Structure formats: C-alpha cells, structure tokens
Amino acid sequence: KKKIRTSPTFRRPKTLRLRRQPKYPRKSAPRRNKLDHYAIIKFPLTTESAMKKIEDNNTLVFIVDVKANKHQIKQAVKKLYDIDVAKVNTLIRPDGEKKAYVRLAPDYDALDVANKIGII
C-alpha cells in the first residue's frame, strides 16, 4: 500500500540504458570506400555474342566486381558513362568474376555509346 502486486511474478524492472559517448574514437578515420565507381566496372566484353547483344538488344555488357549488386552497377554506369539505365541483369561466370548485362534506356542506344568507350 499504495503499491500493489497484481501479478504472482517478480519481473526485473527496467533501468536507465544510456547511449555511448566515448572519450576517443576507436578508429582514427573512417575507412575509405575501396569499392568505388571505378572498382565496380573492370572491363567490358567485346566477344562475338556481346557485340550481337549491343546491336539487337540495346544493352551494354561489362565485367563487374563480385562484391557489387544490381544497384551499385546501375549507379556506376550512370556516373562514369553519363548514360541512363533501365535494368541490370547479373551472372557470375565459371571463370569466377561477375558479368553484368546493363540495359540502357530507349532514349539512348548502345551502338553510339560503345563508340565513345572505344570497345567497337
């Protein structure tokens, strides 16, 4: 009274949990983004079935890093080639690295983008 135990169980009461505020950072600097835009795209493919897909299917094809996802590939082509991307399909080859079929918008076409890159 006037406190009342309307339960047969003693539960542990909740206490004040407060956030950290350390006297020093454990690491001196944030680590550098070592998978940047130039580390996504390694080299394009210039095979006979890659040039056959640039013509008829309106899409580029690169060899990307194995760590990258379909969102980083869509942003790295958008940055260092100044072209817009509709969708990206990816596969990992039996060689070991990952192939990316980046499809352009219907505005652009890959035949006058591969001229600027120089793979043609």
Q: Interface residues with RNA (CB under 7 A)? A: 1-3, 6, 9-24, 48-49, 53, 57, 59, 87, 89, 101, 103
Q: Restricting to residues 48-77, name those near another protein by CB under 8 A.
A: none
> Under the criterion CB under 8 A, does residue 92 sit at the interface with another protein?
yes
Residue 20 binding partner per list RNA, another protein, none, with a CB distance cut-off of 5 to 8 Å that depends on partner kind = RNA
What CA dihedral angle connects 104, 108, 111 and 117, to 10 degrees? -80
> Under the criterion CB under 8 A, does residue 46 sit at the interface with another protein?
yes
Separation between Cα atoms, residue 53 and residue 20, nearest integer Å: 54
Q: Specify the DSSP element, H or E, that contains 62.
A: strand 59-64
Q: Please, which residue, 39 or 86, has the CB nearer to RNA?
A: 86
Do 102 and 50 meet the contact criterion of CB atoms below 8 Å apart? no
